[PDB]
Amino acid sequence: AQYEDGKQYTTLEKPVAGAPQVLEFFSFFCPHCYQFEEVLHISDNVKKKLPEGVKMTKYHVNFMGGDLGKDLTQAWAVAMALGVEDKVTVPLFEGVQKTQTIRSASDIRDVFINAGIKGEEYDAAWNSFVVKSLVAQQEKAAADVQLRGVPAMFVNGKYQLNPQGMDTSNMDVFVQQYADTVKYLSEK
């Protein structure tokens, strides 16, 4: 066929029930994740091609960058709770990988302050049980698919995107193939 299991995607032998429709995993330490966000804009091009009524989920992971990795998973929970994902994603990526100015939880906090989130509001979220459970959800979703690598995308808890099996000679063509594959899987 044109889309084949094991080529543009793989199928989970152990399907995950009740999973988010489109589920994306990343790490601010992850070099292809930086590309996916900054250069390729994968998330946004997938959205542009998803049907009506499909919601999109993005979670951070712990298994890169040790202690800071975990702080970043909690910070991403804060961002989700406050709904400020679109204001902190770029400076977090650049703070970790470009300028390397993020070395502690306090530096992560600085990024939010600079993006205009108020200190009191950040610290209250950071310490909230709503953020605790948001962290729990991120961990659980990644555990459910025994995730050992990022970037990763899963569709309906059953299919996993396989970007190694798409041409990379042209970045635009790669992105559209990726998004079209998500749409195909979505309609499956």
Side-chain angles (χ1 to χ4, degrees):
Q2 294 282 346
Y3 292 99
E4 305 193 297
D5 191 350
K7 176 67 202 170
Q8 298 105 320
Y9 67 102
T10 54
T11 308
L12 296 194
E13 56 184 62
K14 263 247 203 173
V16 170
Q21 296 174 282
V22 178
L23 184 41
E24 186 175 344
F25 293 98
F26 79 109
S27 168
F28 285 109
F29 279 98
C30 159
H32 284 129
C33 302
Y34 188 112
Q35 289 292 296
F36 265 44
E37 174 64 27
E38 305 277 287
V39 185
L40 300 179
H41 310 282
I42 291 288
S43 292
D44 179 64
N45 280 277
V46 170
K47 168 176 208 148
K48 288 194 295 81
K49 282 193 163 162
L50 290 175
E52 236 191 289
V54 198
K55 81 176 307 296
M56 213 154 161
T57 307
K58 174 138 72 192
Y59 289 160
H60 198 268
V61 301
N62 292 343
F63 63 79
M64 299 186 78
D67 213 286
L68 254 190
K70 284 208 82 169
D71 278 325
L72 282 167
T73 296
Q74 193 164 348
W76 188 247
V78 174
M80 288 188 290
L82 299 178
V84 298
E85 296 94 325
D86 293 349
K87 302 162 177 211
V88 294
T89 289
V90 164
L92 288 170
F93 266 118
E94 307 199 339
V96 178
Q97 298 185 44
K98 190 184 177 179
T99 60
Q100 285 176 358
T101 44
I102 295 176
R103 298 173 237 79
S104 71
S106 174
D107 301 338
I108 297 172
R109 180 173 185 279
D110 288 344
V111 167
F112 285 71
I113 300 304
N114 189 50
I117 293 87
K118 302 162 176 191
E120 335 78 7
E121 190 184 5
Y122 183 85
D123 302 329
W126 182 269
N127 287 306
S128 73
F129 288 89
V130 169
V131 158
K132 291 211 192 314
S133 75
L134 228 32
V135 170
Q137 287 164 234
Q138 294 183 88
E139 295 186 18
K140 180 179 183 288
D144 285 347
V145 303
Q146 298 175 327
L147 183 75
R148 93 177 76 94
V150 284
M153 187 175 297
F154 298 87
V155 181
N156 304 109
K158 244 194 160 295
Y159 301 114
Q160 180 186 348
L161 273 290
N162 189 50
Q164 328 67 9
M166 312 174 182
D167 197 333
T168 60
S169 82
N170 179 294
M171 310 188 92
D172 301 305
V173 172
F174 169 77
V175 173
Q176 290 326 314
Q177 185 174 5
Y178 196 102
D180 291 345
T181 298
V182 178
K183 181 176 188 283
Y184 157 81
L185 290 175
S186 181
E187 286 154 8
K188 221 180 162 81

PDB file of all heavy atoms in Angstrom, residues 28 34 72 92 96 131 156:
ATOM      1  N   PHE A  28      12.937  19.245  26.405  1.00  0.00           N
ATOM      2  CA  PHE A  28      13.670  20.464  26.054  1.00  0.00           C
ATOM      3  C   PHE A  28      15.170  20.194  25.876  1.00  0.00           C
ATOM      4  O   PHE A  28      15.923  21.060  25.401  1.00  0.00           O
ATOM      5  CB  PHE A  28      13.406  21.552  27.113  1.00  0.00           C
ATOM      6  CG  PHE A  28      12.029  22.180  27.003  1.00  0.00           C
ATOM      7  CD1 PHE A  28      11.059  21.927  27.952  1.00  0.00           C
ATOM      8  CD2 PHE A  28      11.709  23.010  25.940  1.00  0.00           C
ATOM      9  CE1 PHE A  28       9.804  22.496  27.836  1.00  0.00           C
ATOM     10  CE2 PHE A  28      10.454  23.585  25.839  1.00  0.00           C
ATOM     11  CZ  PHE A  28       9.513  23.322  26.779  1.00  0.00           C
ATOM     12  N   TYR A  34      13.932  20.152  19.324  1.00  0.00           N
ATOM     13  CA  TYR A  34      14.201  21.556  19.014  1.00  0.00           C
ATOM     14  C   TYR A  34      13.877  21.853  17.542  1.00  0.00           C
ATOM     15  O   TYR A  34      13.197  22.826  17.217  1.00  0.00           O
ATOM     16  CB  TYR A  34      15.675  21.860  19.342  1.00  0.00           C
ATOM     17  CG  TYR A  34      16.098  23.312  19.267  1.00  0.00           C
ATOM     18  CD1 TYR A  34      16.445  24.007  20.430  1.00  0.00           C
ATOM     19  CD2 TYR A  34      16.149  23.993  18.052  1.00  0.00           C
ATOM     20  CE1 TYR A  34      16.842  25.350  20.380  1.00  0.00           C
ATOM     21  CE2 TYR A  34      16.556  25.341  17.991  1.00  0.00           C
ATOM     22  CZ  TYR A  34      16.904  26.004  19.160  1.00  0.00           C
ATOM     23  OH  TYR A  34      17.280  27.333  19.114  1.00  0.00           O
ATOM     24  N   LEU A  72      11.908  20.364  34.397  1.00  0.00           N
ATOM     25  CA  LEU A  72      11.286  20.801  33.149  1.00  0.00           C
ATOM     26  C   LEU A  72       9.914  20.145  32.934  1.00  0.00           C
ATOM     27  O   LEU A  72       9.002  20.773  32.411  1.00  0.00           O
ATOM     28  CB  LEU A  72      12.241  20.530  31.981  1.00  0.00           C
ATOM     29  CG  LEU A  72      13.377  21.580  31.873  1.00  0.00           C
ATOM     30  CD1 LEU A  72      14.446  21.049  30.912  1.00  0.00           C
ATOM     31  CD2 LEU A  72      12.849  22.947  31.407  1.00  0.00           C
ATOM     32  N   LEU A  92      12.417  28.239  26.459  1.00  0.00           N
ATOM     33  CA  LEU A  92      12.931  27.074  27.166  1.00  0.00           C
ATOM     34  C   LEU A  92      13.863  26.269  26.261  1.00  0.00           C
ATOM     35  O   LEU A  92      14.988  25.924  26.652  1.00  0.00           O
ATOM     36  CB  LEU A  92      11.783  26.210  27.693  1.00  0.00           C
ATOM     37  CG  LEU A  92      11.051  26.855  28.872  1.00  0.00           C
ATOM     38  CD1 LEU A  92       9.772  26.093  29.217  1.00  0.00           C
ATOM     39  CD2 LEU A  92      11.968  27.047  30.125  1.00  0.00           C
ATOM     40  N   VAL A  96      17.839  26.008  27.191  1.00  0.00           N
ATOM     41  CA  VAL A  96      18.528  24.731  27.363  1.00  0.00           C
ATOM     42  C   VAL A  96      19.571  24.440  26.266  1.00  0.00           C
ATOM     43  O   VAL A  96      20.689  24.022  26.567  1.00  0.00           O
ATOM     44  CB  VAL A  96      17.543  23.530  27.393  1.00  0.00           C
ATOM     45  CG1 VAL A  96      18.328  22.238  27.522  1.00  0.00           C
ATOM     46  CG2 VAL A  96      16.548  23.660  28.554  1.00  0.00           C
ATOM     47  N   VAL A 131      -0.872  20.874  39.575  1.00  0.00           N
ATOM     48  CA  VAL A 131       0.341  20.633  38.803  1.00  0.00           C
ATOM     49  C   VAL A 131       0.937  19.262  39.119  1.00  0.00           C
ATOM     50  O   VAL A 131       1.346  18.562  38.200  1.00  0.00           O
ATOM     51  CB  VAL A 131       1.377  21.781  39.025  1.00  0.00           C
ATOM     52  CG1 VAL A 131       2.787  21.334  38.706  1.00  0.00           C
ATOM     53  CG2 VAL A 131       0.984  22.980  38.187  1.00  0.00           C
ATOM     54  N   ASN A 156      -4.387   7.812  18.672  1.00  0.00           N
ATOM     55  CA  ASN A 156      -5.373   6.975  19.349  1.00  0.00           C
ATOM     56  C   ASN A 156      -4.798   5.811  20.150  1.00  0.00           C
ATOM     57  O   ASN A 156      -5.392   4.730  20.183  1.00  0.00           O
ATOM     58  CB  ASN A 156      -6.393   6.386  18.359  1.00  0.00           C
ATOM     59  CG  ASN A 156      -7.112   7.437  17.540  1.00  0.00           C
ATOM     60  OD1 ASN A 156      -6.885   7.577  16.336  1.00  0.00           O
ATOM     61  ND2 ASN A 156      -7.965   8.211  18.203  1.00  0.00           N
TER      62      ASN A 156
END
